[PDB]
């Protein structure tokens with residue numbers, strides 16, 4: 001039976017700087033039989049790449065978008081949203097949406113991999129951890145971890161503040177087509193309105209024929 | 215846990231609505247046939 | 258969740274009302290047909 | 295005279311049922327094509343919404359039901375054969391739709407088996423929505439096939 005595919009990033013940071021090298025690996029148990037090519041979709045466009053690992057030596061602004069990988073005989077993998085900016089300081093995150101009791105890694109990175117020291121991480125404009133150089137990966141994330149995050153650090157000896165990024169830590173209610181869950185209620189409501197109109201017409205005709213067939 | 219209950223609820227609601235719509239269509243057809251037959255026979 | 262629950266409740270009330278009305282109308286039309294025969 | 299006497303109202307009732315089923319199928323097809331026809335989702339999960347089956351089947355059902363309803367009023371004493379042929383071809387259409395429906399159902403069952411956390415992403419959720427649509431369309435197609443076979447056997451009996 002066909003299996004699901006998964007896409008991994010090297011480095012796993014979904015936010016990278018311009019010109020950085022990122023490798024996208026799509027191994028979703030493709031070894032069911034023989035080796036096979038891969039299908040890559042970027043903004044609904046089938047790129048001419050059919051390799052397991054896609055390498056972007058010089059990431060650009062246009063490289064950002066929606067990335068979906070699919071192996072032959074397997075379903076499409078989960079989409080990955082790549083975000084590339086050109087700021088002095090960036091707050092790289094492993095993922096944008098984290099489930100309950102999940103784990104996600106956050107790291108503050110400087111331009112051209114410059115030395116960054118005395119980094120303070122603020123959540124909802126409130127500092128929660130002061131890290132010298134180590135990442136601030138959080139384990140067992142709860143609903144209280146949802147909010148906006150941004151890291152403020154020192155590039156060489158100059159103070160800089162990274163752009164604010166919103167990370168939503170919620171339950172399994174990922175949502176998107178929950179209004180399509182109202183499609184069945186809307187359809188049955190429309191059907192009941194049609195039935196009510198039919199009943200009105202039926203009772204009017206019944207009264208008319210009662211005055212007729214009396 | 216939570217979504218399957220509303221899934222089954224919507225499924226049974228649609229089934230009951232379809233059954234009721236078929237019943238009402240049958241009733242409308244029967245009453246129209248009776249009315250037209252009575253009108254043709256009396257007039 | 259709660260939205261589809263309250264929608265189900267109001268739609269069940271509507272369906273019960275419609276079923277009662279249909280039963281009354283069917284009884285009336287059956288009595289009329291029996292009297293016609 | 296069993297069905298020979300029972301058909302007088304059953305023909306109209308099953309024609310109305312066919313019209314209703316066609317209308318619901320057309321509504322489902324339009325909604326899915328307008329909303330759930332993005333390139334991000336895979337093609338195997340949307341097996342029904344790939345060959346134009348919903349629109350074609352809805353059109354055939356609507357045409358057959360309309361012809362049956364018009365013929366039930368004894369219009370020109372000619373539409374009986376046309377309605378019989380339309381429902382005869384609608385029987386094969388409903389059989390093909392049932393085959394497509396069961397294929398989509400088993401594909402969605404495989405996809406849900408691949409899913410582990412029960413709608414942990416957009417793909418599993420849209421697969422669940424697609425299989426709900428598959429079950430609903432299977433029920434509607436069973437009803438429509440019963441209507442078509444009853445109408446066809448009744449018209450065959452009449453034309454003999």
Ligand SMILES: *[C@@H]1O[C@H](CO)[C@@H](O[C@@H]2O[C@H](CO)[C@@H](O[C@@H]3O[C@H](CO)[C@@H](O)[C@H](O)[C@@H]3O)[C@H](O)[C@H]2NC(C)=O)[C@H](O)[C@H]1NC(C)=O
Pocket residue numbers: 042043061062063064065066082083084
């Ligand atoms: C497919 O969609 C993606 C978005 O997921 C597009 O990337 C977005 O557009 C450009 C990259 O070409 C980035 O620059 C920004 O463009 C906007 C206009 O959309 C402009 O107002 C800004 O000033 C800036 O120049 C944009 O940041 C990027 N989006 C993200 C979130 O990074 C991509 O271009 C699309 N594909 C094609 C072929 O256009």
Ligand SMILES: *[C@@H]1O[C@H](CO)[C@@H](O[C@@H]2O[C@H](CO)[C@@H](O[C@@H]3O[C@H](CO)[C@@H](O)[C@H](O)[C@@H]3O)[C@H](O)[C@H]2NC(C)=O)[C@H](O)[C@H]1NC(C)=O
Pocket residue numbers: 081083084085163164165166
């Ligand atoms: C991808 O990266 C871009 C950065 O290039 C993100 O855009 C940033 O979004 C935040 C919102 O959380 C913006 O902050 C807000 O900016 C407005 C501007 O008027 C300000 O009034 C607010 O008080 C707040 O500071 C930030 O400016 C914006 N950055 C840029 C360069 O436009 C984007 O959110 C990331 N994600 C996606 C999915 O695009």
Ligand SMILES: *[C@@H]1O[C@H](CO)[C@@H](O)[C@H](O)[C@H]1NC(C)=O
Pocket residue numbers: 037050051052
């Ligand atoms: C992609 O396909 C082309 C043509 O089939 C082939 O020449 C190329 O080697 C493939 N790419 C990889 C990475 O194998």
Ligand SMILES: *[C@@H]1O[C@H](CO)[C@@H](O)[C@H](O)[C@H]1NC(C)=O
Pocket residue numbers: 128129130131134135136
């Ligand atoms: C801050 O980050 C460190 C990582 O060095 C981690 O051990 C700690 O639990 C985090 N939180 C606090 C309140 O220190």
Ligand SMILES: *[C@@H]1O[C@H](CO)[C@@H](O)[C@H](O)[C@H]1NC(C)=O
Pocket residue numbers: 144
């Ligand atoms: C989450 O945050 C809110 C407001 O910041 C607070 O009232 C609540 O107690 C927090 N949750 C827990 C479990 O402490």
